[PDB]
Amino acid sequence: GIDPNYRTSRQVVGEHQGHKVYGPVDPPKVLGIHGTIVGVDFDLCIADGSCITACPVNVFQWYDTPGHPASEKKADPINEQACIFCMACVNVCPVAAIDVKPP
Ligand code: SF4
Numbered sequence: 001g002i003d004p005n006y007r008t009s010r011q012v013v014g015e016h017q018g019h020k021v022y023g024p025v026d027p028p029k030v031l032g033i034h035g036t037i038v039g040v041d042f043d044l045c046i047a048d049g050s051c052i053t054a055c056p057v058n059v060f061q062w063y064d065t066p067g068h069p070a071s072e073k074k075a076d077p078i079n080e081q082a083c084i085f086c087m088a089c090v091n092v093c094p095v096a097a098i099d100v101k102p103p
């Protein structure tokens with residue numbers, strides 16, 4: 001579900017907890033994609049939680065996004081530098097909102 005080319009096709013509009021945020025972002029309904037090594041489309045994430053339950057290195061943590069039409073929290077890749085590219089998260093997300101890319 002997430003654009004595999006976001007890193008080159010969306011402008012970086014900001015930073016969040018050590019990771020970049022890829023625009024556009026128009027809160028609270030449009031929040032864009034968070035992260036570079038491990039990218040999560042906040043506009044697609046429905047807060048299923050499988051990715052967070054699946055990551056062996058705990059890259060993801062719940063992040064509140066009140067008033068987003070898709071969910072009031074999401075998986076924020078705050079510990080993306082720790083990713084070991086097992087690709088578990090990418091396979092289990094029910095909306096395919098995650099894209100991982102070796103630096
Ligand atoms: S690829 Fe593996 S390690 Fe990297 S985030 Fe996804 S689950 Fe965690």
Ligand code: F3S
Nearest residue numbers: 045046048049051093
């Ligand atoms: S829905 Fe959101 S929580 Fe994880 S499994 Fe998909 S990104």
Ligand SMILES: [Zn+2]
Nearest residue numbers: 016034076077
């Ligand atoms: Zn973030």
